[PDB]
Design a protein around this ligand. Structure first.
Ligand SMILES: Nc1ncnc2c1ncn2[C@@H]1O[C@H](COP(=O)(O)OP(=O)(O)OP(=O)(O)O)[C@@H](O)[C@H]1O
Ligand SMILES: Nc1ncnc2c1ncn2[C@@H]1O[C@H](COP(=O)(O)OP(=O)(O)OP(=O)(O)O)[C@@H](O)[C@H]1O
Ligand SMILES: O=c1[nH]cc(F)c(=O)[nH]1
Ligand SMILES: [Mg+2]
Ligand SMILES: [Mg+2]
Length: 1218
């Protein structure tokens, strides 16, 4: 991958010519890492990191010498100033040209108003001034982009060096430092804060260019016009504190609305998660009411924020007109006269100085402040303590011995109890030493202390040679499994075969698709704990070390793999090297050569297994303690009348803005065509003031109207799509994951609320300004129309060409920015294992490779943007030059003011055109959010909540249930879960459900509740179920679900959301719940707000609340879903006794995984994969030995079978023969 920047002439380099092959490839097909362009060797991360290491270490040596604090800022400056000053020189000369251009404009105009048809020397001077103006425009619009690239490349180099520094420091930090900090912040700053370096460098050079430019412009204007320069500069400067005040107010309002935004996101996540339960309880009306209220409360604040944003933007639009109006009002009232030169000189100078002062200086100052904060945080992290080096790399002469004497170490020095006390043990190669103790006694602490990560407070420790160690928690860095096993060591086929046959990993190889080359992501999401432990053991054994340390490696695996691993990896292999192992399994201690008992940090007994057996101490005892999107989006706002009014207001404001300078030109022309008689100042000043105030008012009104319409459209879209999704069937929510359905609630709507209105308004404003300037340029000289068509077609083709390649780069960089973060996270998580081996330069090298790839993506992203910018500026400069030369060529018929207006607007098209193009690209890129929202607008709807045929309020009188050829089906074109159910359910009877967790169980509940449209005929009290509205059906059929889930809020709403009960009834029912005393201790008597899903409550309390809601809704027909899964037997017997003592007159359908709760049931469905097999009394069912219910009973055993038979028979005799 050669870098063409190596072979690039300066003429080609300035024009960015070398990117032509890459852009041709991007047009032909897509982009990928293969098409990537390798970075310059100087741009590599390793060299920058080495330089920054040298400089930072030098300054910290200086700081230690001088007895003072260090300075990352000082190090960075002393590293980069010598190579950053030349770009400052270049920006100085560029700004000199930028400020000298209007003087040449004034000279050319000065030629115009003194026209002489027969003169030639004046025309030659005019051409000379025009061509030096061409030089000025070309140098402003050509070399500026190369300077910008070099500035941003210096910033990128700085960011890369800082990242390499922070990773290198993180990989070599101490245990106390890790305890103080966390893996979250340490990746958070590297992901967010360091990115300020790629933005601060861009505006940095304007700190020393702003005031100098302002002073130069002020001096020029003081020379040109007179006293009005002070007034103009004062008005322009007063804008800045106003900008700061609006920024502060907007930030405060955004912080105020953030809490409402977070509350809405949290509650909508909650309803999405608990959507099956909320659908089965028919509280979606209350939830929709709450969401609507919160949405209105949020929309008020965001409407205020949008209004403030629009006011700020309109004030920006009218600032230049206000400044020039004040300046010229002072100019005329002082007693001076108006010509056609000074007018446009002042206008252009104001444009330039206003742009610099308002758009660059404050952004530069705030980015510098943010970068200083970033450097302060980075140095705060960097000055953290470091692990003391041990025995350098390897000076020892092998010394294959391990010894520990009088060892007492502290995990923390502040604690009073040493973790381990007075360790004394030595081990030799070929010894199978082991340690056994209670969980948490410090065996892992002993292992780590041997690893050297624990500072020896007392005694001596001597371990020599490279060490292989396995952590208790499995760790695998993301990548190919072969790479994880190899650890970076060279590949040996026979060794890999021996390891793979010894570790019994062939099963994992054949299970995984790629086998040995399978890709594993973060935290081993593609594998299991046992597989990860086996992988770690395989890596350790392949390392082929001398001292082996294992921390409970066989705990999270089965017996066969554990015995195979232990035997055929130690008993015939590790009997020659140093082996220290800790196990919670006592079976393997027979083969252990040495065994130690450790508890309370002190040794108890060390010896052989037979010696411990003779001692009589029990180890076990010790172990136990497009366009249509635009059309719909704009229609959702308001009717087209408001749209045409808005476009008319846009046109009126733009025409007034142009007419202000046109009136200046007309005033200059009329003054020139004179002669004493004096022009009536009142008329012209009044018309000028009227035009200026019209511009300001129309801009304000336009911005407010645009924001109002867009915000109203967003609100209407959100309401419509939420109302649509709330009525969506459960199939949509089963198919779409929770994260996917919440993404368009938390992100797309957010963008539609706070970014699309402003961005669209800014784009339309810039487009109107550009089209107005071009219209002026055409109107002044009608002949400029001819080149305009080729210019436009060339621009359109260029935009398409650049956009067909920019998207690929912008997505490739985003994709490539994640692996560095993943690598940092995984390496930090496995830091103990990483430092156990001497190998860390390899980890540094892979980090360097990932950083190089990310920097390569950044480099291409920079170069493509610079190429597009230079092409656009070339076109704009061509326009400027053609306007100027046409004006000079046809000067015999024009006049000074008209020419000046034309050429000044041609001058100011610079930057405006670029901003318009960039904002158009951003808008067409980000429209995808409302595309997703409108896609969510029209999900399919279920049956209407209320039918025309309203059921009688008294139904059900009895509760007879009829199943007639009932077939349930999860989705169309899917398996038939239920097959022709035919049964009758009488009034006030108890029905059980048997079988297995493969018969459907919940399928019947889904059919009755109609989560999905079923097939067949079901009659409830001689009424066909399909003819009852969903709210008129589910409201009168209660259920206690799989997992009870309480909802965020108070108990009052969380029990009776629709509020048809009384406080006395609430307290009474809660008293029979027996949680009344449990709840009458909270800060609120009954209004205490609960945590998420009752985190402070127990599952039994959840079940009690559910049965409370059931008894309060007191419908005849109820269903219970596996009331006990892992609940304590006390709360179990409570819930069964309540359910059997409160529902004597209520029909109940019971489903459960255990027969004891349903052995007393009068009747039972026998279900098998949706097929009804038997239906009779349970004792009659078990009377037949061939019955499947009897087989299920006999599966458990005999004594429980006998008890169930006794209970069923006594129920049968008591009921049938009273
Ligand atoms: N980062 C740490 N800071 C303080 N103490 C620690 C740290 N890591 C481990 N420990 C100590 O290690 C013990 C917890 O280890 P663990 O529960 O894994 O059992 P163990 O007795 O060390 O050995 P084994 O893992 O073999 O069962 C506690 O004594 C705890 O204080
Ligand atoms: N969300 C789902 N989408 C599609 N099929 C499903 C879904 N949930 C379950 N199934 C399938 O439907 C059948 C029965 O579903 P279910 O899991 O309710 O049965 P069960 O185990 O007998 O009951 P329970 O869920 O009460 O334990 C099985 O084949 C199961 O794989
Ligand atoms: O010409 C411009 N340059 C930079 C900007 F941010 C902007 O709005 N306009
Ligand atoms: Mg431990
Ligand atoms: Mg199931």
């Amino acid at each position: 991958k050669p870098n063409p920047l190596q072979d690039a002439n300066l003429c080609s380099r300035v024009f960015f010519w070398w990117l032509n092959p890459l852009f041709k490839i991007g047009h032909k097909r897509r982009l990928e890492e293969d098409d990537m362009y390798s970075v310059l060797p100087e741009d590599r991360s390793q060299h920058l990191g080495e330089e920054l290491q040298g400089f930072w270490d030098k300054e910290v040596l200086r700081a230690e010498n001088d007895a003072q604090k260090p300075s990352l800022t000082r190090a960075i400056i002393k590293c980069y100033w010598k190579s950053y000053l030349v770009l400052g020189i270049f920006t100085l000369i560029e700004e000199s040209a930028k400020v000298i251009q209007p003087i040449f404009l004034g000279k050319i105009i000065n030629y115009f108003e003194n026209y002489d048809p027969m003169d030639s020397v004046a025309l030659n001077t005019a051409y000379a001034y025009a061509t030096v103006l061409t030089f000025c425009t070309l140098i402003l619009a050509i070399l500026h982009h190369l300077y910008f690239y070099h500035v941003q490349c210096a910033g990128m180099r700085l960011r890369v060096a800082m990242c390499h520094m922070i990773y290198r420091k993180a990989l070599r930090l101490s245990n106390m430092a890790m305890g103080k900090t966390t893996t979250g912040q340490i990746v958070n700053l590297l992901s967010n804060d360091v990115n300020k370096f790629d933005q601060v460098t861009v505006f940095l050079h304007f700190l020393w260019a702003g005031p100098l430019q302002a002073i130069a412009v002020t001096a020029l204007l003081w020379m040109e016009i007179g006293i009005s320069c002070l007034a103009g500069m004062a008005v322009l400067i007063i804008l800045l504190p106003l900008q700061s005040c609006f920024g502060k107010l907007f930030s405060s309002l955004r912080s105020k609305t953030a809490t409402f935004t977070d509350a809405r996101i949290r509650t909508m996540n909650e309803v999405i998660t608990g959507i099956r339960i909320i659908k089965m309880y028919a509280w979606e009306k209350s939830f929709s009411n709450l969401i609507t209220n919160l949405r209105k409360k949020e929309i008020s604040k965001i409407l205020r924020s949008s209004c403030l944003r629009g006011m700020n933007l309109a004030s920006f639009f009218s600032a230049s007109k206000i400044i020039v109006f004040v300046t010229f009002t002072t100019y005329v009232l002082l007693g001076s006269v108006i010509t056609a030169s000074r007018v446009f000189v002042a206008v252009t100078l104001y444009g330039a100085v206003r742009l610099t002062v308002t758009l660059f200086f404050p952004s530069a100052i705030e980015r510098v402040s943010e970068a200083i904060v970033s450097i302060r945080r980075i140095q705060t992290f960097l000055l953290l303590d470091e692990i003391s080096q041990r025995n350098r790399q390897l000076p020892s002469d092998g010394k294959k011995m391990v010894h520990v004497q009088d060892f007492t170490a502290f995990w923390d020095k502040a604690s009073e109890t040493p973790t381990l006390q007075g360790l004394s043990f030595t081990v030799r190669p070929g010894e199978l030493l082991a340690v056994v103790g209670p969980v948490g006694a410090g065996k892992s602490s002993l292992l780590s202390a041997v690893l050297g990560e624990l500072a020896p407070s007392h005694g001596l420790v001597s371990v020599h040679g490279r060490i292989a160690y396995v952590s208790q928690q499995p760790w695998v860095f993301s990548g190919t499994l072969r790479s994880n096993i190899l650890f970076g060591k060279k590949y040996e086929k026979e060794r890999y075969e021996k390891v793979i046959k010894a570790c019994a990993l062939k099963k994992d190889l054949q299970l995984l698709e790629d086998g040995d080359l399978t890709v594993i992501g973060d935290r081993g999401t593609t594998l299991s704990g046992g597989q990860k432990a086996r992988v770690n053991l395989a890596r350790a054994v392949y390392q082929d070390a001398d001292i082996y340390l294992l921390d409970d490696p066989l705990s999270a695996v089965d017996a066969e793999v554990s015995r195979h691993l232990f035997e055929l990896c130690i008993c015939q292999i590790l009997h020659e090297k140093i082996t220290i192992l800790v196990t919670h399994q006592l079976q393997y201690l027979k083969a252990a050569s040495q065994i130690l008992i450790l508890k309370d940090g002190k040794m108890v007994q060390k010896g052989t297994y037979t010696e411990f057996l003779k001692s009589g101490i029990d180890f076990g005892s010790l172990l136990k303690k497009g366009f249509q999107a635009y059309k719909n989006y704009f229609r959702a706002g308001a009717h087209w009348i408001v749209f045409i009014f808005l476009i008319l207001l846009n046109t009126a404001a733009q025409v007034a803005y142009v007419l202000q300078d046109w009136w200046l030109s007309y005033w200059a022309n009329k003054q020139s065509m004179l002669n004493t008689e004096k022009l009536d100042l009142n008329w012209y000043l009044g018309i000028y003031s009227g035009l200026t105030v019209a511009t300001v008012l129309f801009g304000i009104a336009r911005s407010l109207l645009v924001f109002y319409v867009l915000v109203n459209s967003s609100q209407t879209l959100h309401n419509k799509m939420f109302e649509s999704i709330l009525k969506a069937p459960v199939l949509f929510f089963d198919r779409n994951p929770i994260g996917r359905i919440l993404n368009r609630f938390s992100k797309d709507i957010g963008h539609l609320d706070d970014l699309l209105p402003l961005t669209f308004l800014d784009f339309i404003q810039t487009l109107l300004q550009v089209v107005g300037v071009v219209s002026v340029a055409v109107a002044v000289i009608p002949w400029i129309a001819i080149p305009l068509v080729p210019l436009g077609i060339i621009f359109i083709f260029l935009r398409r060409y650049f956009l067909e390649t920019s998207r690929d780069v912008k997505r490739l960089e985003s994709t490539t920015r994640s692996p560095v973060f993943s690598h940092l996270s995984s390496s930090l998580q496995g830091l103990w294992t990483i430092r156990a081996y001497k190998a860390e330069e390899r980890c540094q090298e892979l980090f360097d490779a990932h950083q190089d790839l990310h920097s390569e993506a950044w480099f291409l992203f920079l170069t493509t943007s610079r190429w597009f910018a230079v092409r656009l500026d070339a076109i704009c400069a061509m326009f400027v030059i053609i306007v100027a030369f046409g004006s000079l060529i046809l000067a015999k018929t024009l006049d000074a003011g008209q020419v000046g207006l034309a050429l000044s607007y041609a001058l100011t098209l610079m930057g405006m055109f670029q901003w318009c193009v960039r904002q158009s690209a951003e808008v067409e890129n980000m429209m995808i959010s409302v595309e997703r929202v409108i896609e969510y607008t029209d999900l399919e709807k279920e049956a209407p909540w209320e039918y025309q045929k309203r059921p009688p309020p008294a139904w059900p009188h009895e509760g007879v249930i009829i199943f007639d050829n009932v077939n349930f089906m999860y989705s169309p074109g899917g398996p038939l879960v239920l097959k022709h159910l035919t049964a009758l359910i009488k009034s006030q009877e108890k029905v059980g459900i048997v079988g297995r967790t493969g018969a459907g169980k919940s399928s019947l509940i889904s059919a009755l509740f109609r989560l999905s449209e079923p097939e067949g005929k079901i009659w409830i009290d001689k009424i066909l179920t399909t003819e009852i509205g969903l709210h008129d059906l589910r409201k009168k059929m209660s259920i206690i679900p799989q997992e009870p889930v309480l909802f965020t809020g108070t108990m009052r709403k969380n029990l009776d959301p629709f509020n048809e009960h009384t406080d006395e009834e609430l307290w009474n029912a809660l008293q029979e719940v027996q949680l009344k005393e449990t709840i009458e201790d909270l800060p609120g008597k009954m209004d205490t707000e609960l945590a998420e899903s009752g985190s402070n409550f127990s599952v039994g309390q959840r079940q009690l609340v559910c049965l409370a809601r059931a008894i309060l809704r007191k419908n005849q027909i109820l269903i219970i879903d596996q009331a006990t899964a892992n609940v304590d037997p006390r709360t179990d017997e409570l819930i069964q006794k309540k359910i059997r003592e409160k529902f004597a007159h209520c029909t109940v359908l019971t489903i459960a995984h255990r027969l004891n709760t349903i052995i007393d049931s009068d009747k039972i469905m026998v279900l098998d994969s949706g097929r009804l097999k038997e239906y009779d009394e349970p004792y009659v069912l078990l009377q037949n030995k061939e019955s499947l219910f009897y087989k299920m009973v006999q599966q458990l055993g005999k004594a429980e079978a006998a008890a169930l038979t006794e209970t069923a028979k006594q129920v049968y005799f008591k009921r049938n023969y009273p």
